[PDB]
Structures are given as structure tokens and as C-alpha cells.
Amino acid sequence: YMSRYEEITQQLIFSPKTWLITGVAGFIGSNLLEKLLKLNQVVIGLDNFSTGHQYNLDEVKTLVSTEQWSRFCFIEGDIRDLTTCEQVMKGVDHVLHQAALGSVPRSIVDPITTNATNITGFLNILHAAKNAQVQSFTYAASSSTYGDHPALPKVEENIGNPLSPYAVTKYVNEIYAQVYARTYGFKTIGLRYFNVFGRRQDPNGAYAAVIPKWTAAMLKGDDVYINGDGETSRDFCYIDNVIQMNILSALAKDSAKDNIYNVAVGDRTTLNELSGYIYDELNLIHHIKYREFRSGDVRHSQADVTKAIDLLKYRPNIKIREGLRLSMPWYVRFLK
Amino acid sequence: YMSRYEEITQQLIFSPKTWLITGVAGFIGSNLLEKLLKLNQVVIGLDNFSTGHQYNLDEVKTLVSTEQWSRFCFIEGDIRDLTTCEQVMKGVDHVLHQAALGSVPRSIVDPITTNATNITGFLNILHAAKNAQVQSFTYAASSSTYGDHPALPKVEENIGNPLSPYAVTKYVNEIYAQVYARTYGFKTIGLRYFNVFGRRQDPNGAYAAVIPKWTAAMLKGDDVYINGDGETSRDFCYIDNVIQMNILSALAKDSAKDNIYNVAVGDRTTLNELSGYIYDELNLIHHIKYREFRSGDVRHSQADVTKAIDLLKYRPNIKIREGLRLSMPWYVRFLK
Ligand SMILES: NC(=O)c1ccc[n+]([C@@H]2O[C@H](COP(=O)([O-])OP(=O)(O)OC[C@H]3O[C@@H](n4cnc5c(N)ncnc54)[C@H](O)[C@@H]3O)[C@@H](O)[C@H]2O)c1
Ligand SMILES: NC(=O)c1ccc[n+]([C@@H]2O[C@H](COP(=O)([O-])OP(=O)(O)OC[C@H]3O[C@@H](n4cnc5c(N)ncnc54)[C@H](O)[C@@H]3O)[C@@H](O)[C@H]2O)c1
């Protein structure tokens, strides 16, 4: 059961609102679009197809009715342009801001481009939303905001130094959100995502996340590379857990706003465990080498999600094996 | 005696280098230009004349010799354009990055342009500088970074939450700088300036700083606004102490780099005191009412400059009363 969550989605079904999703053509965005359209919401979407894909939009369309898709207004455009930000904001109740350039290695090769989309574009959306006086604003933050802080599990109040240009960008997101609360009274919720996975996560390109990458590699019969001894560990968070936290945040009482929340399960899985999980799941529906640790890699990562549970009534009910079970058939179809 | 500073300027005169000053037409940038040309350095200046002035460059021209002037190459341009940043970096040894749009209330009223000049512009310059392999990189940071930290005096390690968009941008400069050292080995110095004042600080405009605004006012015979009751206090730091810190930073030992330094004198002057010191200094060269409070603005500010004194051998020569005595003759000439 997902019960404050069930009650809210029930309520959305009876009383549609207007939502903005930036990054709507992307992994998390397109999953939010699918859920909102099935709740019969009115969705305004923004994307420049930098890392996102028309084919994601095309997939959502074949999963919703004609009438539900008629409530989707898609604008191809860039959050780095303030005018565009202000146009897509007209009439909007709830902002779900997911548009960013993720990937730590990307940000090291080209910090300029990562800065402009993740800081400039983020500020544009935050400032448009504040001017338009939307009901809520929730943005994608990042567990890389923990930086070099040694605590584990990671608790929201205790962060360290950021370790890459990417991490600076997501941290600045939070500090700006905080300043906007203070200066204009505009209260927002930042969501520190941890290793999100599930359908429509891109398995291609140099920056592919491990789950999609390894899944694609298993299905092609290509080498699955483990960086290190394999005892490195993550709190992998199935996509529905994130959808859940986004909707809970858009509809949070005022006292829950101007807050950061970890979004994860609270569990740790090793790379050695993961590899066996993926393989075991793929091989029910049909069809490895060790190398150097990646440089400047975090050894172990795990969220404390107590704050989300207590203040938003989050239930992290989809754990990693269930998540892989649910994600694997989408990869099988996509790759074949 | 500014002993180390003297020795370091002697090295420069014997073995001149190429310097980039961004913000060279502004208050601090033009004082840096003046000292560097007088040391026979080759100087590249970048400015967009947003808050800066041609008249500052014309004044400097009259103060240096012809040969010294012939070593100044001025480029009108914007740090928001990456290409421009790359071009003016060419053959540069030392970067003194001063270009920004200062002022807390400016940032509250336009956090967007402020974000673009002070974050994007900073990163463009930091990144161009890294790729050009400069010998050093020193940037204007801000005592606004202390935020709501309640401790006095202000110590570098101990900062609080940012209280304005401008505080955010100045802090983001430090965090980027720190990431560049960790990620690229590129070691910078950030100077948290505290209430600088001296010749060529603009007395005109909605954002004038208190010393020149009030000086202007008593020369015109206008009303002098003391916000609050007279007691509020600052660490006013005459411009020559800033020039010294810039030059010491540019030639610091490697272990002194990747560090933030308070740039001030360690003193605390009351508004009641200043209003008085200013009247007393002005009226020595011939020729009042209380009010409100502001927002983003602080009751008490005093720097601990131990760190600069110890690590760079900074010697804060000039205290507020003598700075004023030194500054007022420029203010008469400029207004009369
Ligand atoms: N995936 C994770 O595990 C993870 C971890 C930490 C943070 N995040 C954050 O989650 C959000 C979504 O990530 P994702 O996994 O869905 O990534 P994704 O790359 O699949 O989606 C991001 C979307 O943003 C769009 N976009 C990028 N720049 C844009 C711009 N300037 N204007 C308009 N659209 C732009 C892209 O086209 C893409 O459709 C991002 O903010 C990312 O930083 C994700
Ligand atoms: N005066 C103080 O007490 C104080 C305190 C804290 C920080 N600072 C910092 O000191 C630096 C210098 O300040 P100042 O007092 O000399 O201010 P100033 O306004 O006199 O100088 C700023 C200079 O930067 C130039 N500039 C601004 N944006 C630019 C851009 N986008 N491209 C190119 N040039 C641009 C302006 O034209 C100007 O000549 C700034 O970074 C400011 O944030 C000053």
C-alpha cells in the first residue's frame, strides 16, 4: 500500500491540475508524464532533446488514451532561455523540474555546458515559477550533494564538499531554492535522487548508468565490466519510488516545503550482487570482467529516507529485485 | 612597512609578467591597473563598462608614464562570452578576476543577470584560465559569504547560510574554485573583500556604497541617511590593502593557494563614527538625519585577518581614518 500517495492520486483523478514537467522527454520526465496523463492531468512539458528522446514521448503516447494525450502540451525549447521559461509557466499549478545535464564525467570534460543548463536554466525556471506564483515547485536534486561527507546512511542535514562540477551545480540548486524561500517566500522541495533506474533510462552513449548499461550488455552478450572489486554499493531506487516522491512533494502542506528529501529505498546493493540480480532477472525472460575502480568514485552510498517517510508519508515500497523484475521486459523489447 | 609585498613587487619589476585584469574599468580593477603599470607589468584589461567607466581608464592613463601606458591592452568585452574569455587569456601569466555585478539589493531585484555575470562569467574566466595554463588565479569573493553566521570576528572556515542571491553567487565562485583544485590541480586564491573604499569608487547610482554616497552628499550639502541608530559597524578596508592582497596572492607559494582569505583590517567602525570621520576629513579641505533599516543587511561585521597575515605575510597598513584622509581629495576633485 501507498496510502497518502493513493489518496492524493485518487484526488488528482477527480480534480485535475496543471503541471509543468521540464525534462519531459527524458528518463524521469517521461515517466512523470506517463503517470500524470493516466491521472488525467493537464501537463505542459518542456525539452530541448539534448539527452532526451522523441521516442520516449512516442512511447508515452501509445500508453495513454487520445483524450489524455490531448491534455499534453509539448513545447520544444530550452530552460536556458528565460522568455521560454515564462511562457511555459502560464497557468501552471505544480512545477516538476527535471531538466538538467546529469553525469559527473560529462561535467568534468565540459563544465561550461553543465553549468549553463544546471545553474542558469535551473534559476530561470525557479524565477519564472516564483513570478507566476505557482502552487508548488519540486526539483531534481542529487545525492552527489553529499560530497566527501563520511556519514552513511546519508542524512539530509549533513553534507560535505562537492567532488565535481556536476555536484557544484546540484548543490547550487538547493542554495538558490533556499534563498528564494528566504527572500521572496517562495518555498520549494528538492529531491536528492539516489541511483534511479527503470524503463526509458538510456542504455546508450558514454554516460549510461550501470543498470541499463549492464542490461544492454547482457542482452547483446557483451562484456559486463565491474569497476573495482565489486563491493562498491548503491541505494538503487526504482522509478515509481521517484514518481511517488514527486507527487507527494507537489501536494505537500506548507510546513513540509523549503526542505530537501532523500529519495531512495534505504538499502545497499553491491556491484557483485547487482550483476547476479540483473542476470537472474533477464534469464527468466530469456537469452563479466573486473577492471580498475573508476577514479574519484564513491565507495558506498545509502540514503536515510526517514525524513520523507515522516514528513511526506513516503513508502519506499519498490525494492531493487522487484524493480529489476519490472524494468527488464522494457529493455528486452527496446533492444530487440 | 609592507615588507613581503615590497619584495614581491621588486621581483615583478625585474622580471615583468603579463596580467589579466577583468573589471579593469571598475573601482578595484582600475586601482590594480594603476599599480601594475607602475610596476612595468604588461596588462590586458577586459571590461564591458556596465558599472565601470572609461573615465577611470583615462585617469589611470594620466598617472603612469607613456611607456607604462603603452603596455596596457584594453579589450572591451563581456565575461559572459566564452570566446572573449579565451582570447584575452592568451599569453597571460596572472589573472586578477574582479568583473562582477556587486551589491546585495541589485541581486534581489535582478538575480538573473547577476547570476549570468557572477556565476557564468566567473566560470568562463576560471575555465579559460585553466586551459591557458596561467601561473596564478585570484578572484574577488565577498564577506557576504558569512551570511547569517553570528560569530565575530569573521573567520574563514566558519560561514553561515547565504542571505541574498549575491551571497550565493560569491559563494559559488569559491566552491567552483575549490572543485577546480581537486579536479584539475588548478590552485586559486579567493579574496573575501570587506567594505572596500578609496579613490574611483562610484558615488553616483542607486547602489553607491556608503562612504562615497555620504561623501557626495556632504559635498553637495544633501541629507546624510544613517539607517538604524548610528551604532552599526563594518570593517572598512582602504583600497591599497586590497591591491597588496591581490599581488601577494598572485605570487603566493603553492601551499598558500587553494585558500580563501579575509581581506580587511580587523577593525570595527560604527556608522556614527564614519559619518563623523567623513565630516571631519572633508571639512579639513573646506566646504544629518537618522532613518530605516534594509534587507539582506547586517548589524555587525569585523574580519579576522590572521590567516592572510600568517600565510601570505599580509600587512594591513592603512586604517579607516587614514584611508578617508587619503580618499577625500579625490572626491572633491571629482565632484567639483
Ligand atoms: N538518473 C539518476 O539516477 C539521477 C541522479 C541524480 C540526479 N538526477 C536528476 O534527475 C533529472 C532527470 O534525470 P534523468 O535521469 O531523467 O536524465 P535524462 O537525461 O534522461 O533527462 C533529462 C532531460 O532534460 C532535458 N534537458 C537537458 N537540458 C535541457 C535544457 N537546457 N532545456 C530543456 N531540456 C533540457 C533532456 O533533453 C532530457 O530529456 C536531472 O535533473 C538529473 O540531474 C538523476
Ligand atoms: N567594493 C567592495 O566593498 C566589494 C565587496 C565585496 C566584493 N567586491 C567584488 O569586487 C569586485 C570589484 O568590485 P568593485 O567594487 O571594483 O566594483 P565595480 O563595479 O567598480 O567594478 C566591477 C567591474 O566589472 C565590470 N563588469 C561587470 N560585469 C562584467 C561583465 N559581464 N563583463 C565584463 N566586465 C564586467 C564592470 O564594468 C566594472 O568595471 C566585484 O567582483 C565585486 O563583487 C567588492
UniProtKB/Swiss-Prot annotation, chains A, B:
It catalyses: UDP-N-acetyl-alpha-D-glucosamine = UDP-N-acetyl-alpha-D-galactosamine. Its EC number is 5.1.3.7. PANTHER family: BIFUNCTIONAL POLYMYXIN RESISTANCE PROTEIN ARNA, UDP-D-APIOSE_UDP-D-XYLOSE SYNTHASE 2. Optimum temperature is 37 degrees Celsius. Homodimer. The lineage of its organism: Bacteria, Pseudomonadati, Pseudomonadota, Gammaproteobacteria, Enterobacterales. Its cofactor is NAD(+). Keywords: Carbohydrate metabolism, Isomerase, NAD, Nucleotide-binding. It comes from the Bacteria. Optimum pH is 7.0-9.0. Changing S144T: No effect on epimerase activity. NAD(+) binds at residues 23-28, 47-52, 78-79, 98-100, 117, 166, 170, 196. Belongs to the NAD(P)-dependent epimerase/dehydratase family. GO terms for biological process: O antigen biosynthetic process. InterPro entries: Epimerase_deHydtase, Lipid_A_modif_metabolic_enz, NAD(P)-bd_dom_sf. Catalyzes the epimerization of UDP-N-acetylglucosamine (UDP-GlcNAc) to UDP-N-acetylgalactosamine (UDP-GalNAc). Has very low epimerase activity with UDP-Glc and UDP-Gal. Plays a role in the biosynthesis of 2-acetamino-2-deoxy-L-altruronic acid, a building block of the O-antigen in bacterial lipopolysaccharide (LPS). Substrate binds at residues 142-143, 193-195, 210-213, 225-227, 234, 294-297. Pathway: Bacterial outer membrane biogenesis; LPS O-antigen biosynthesis. This is UDP-N-acetylglucosamine 4-epimerase. Binds 1 NAD(+) per subunit. GO terms for molecular function: nucleotide binding; UDP-N-acetylglucosamine 4-epimerase activity.
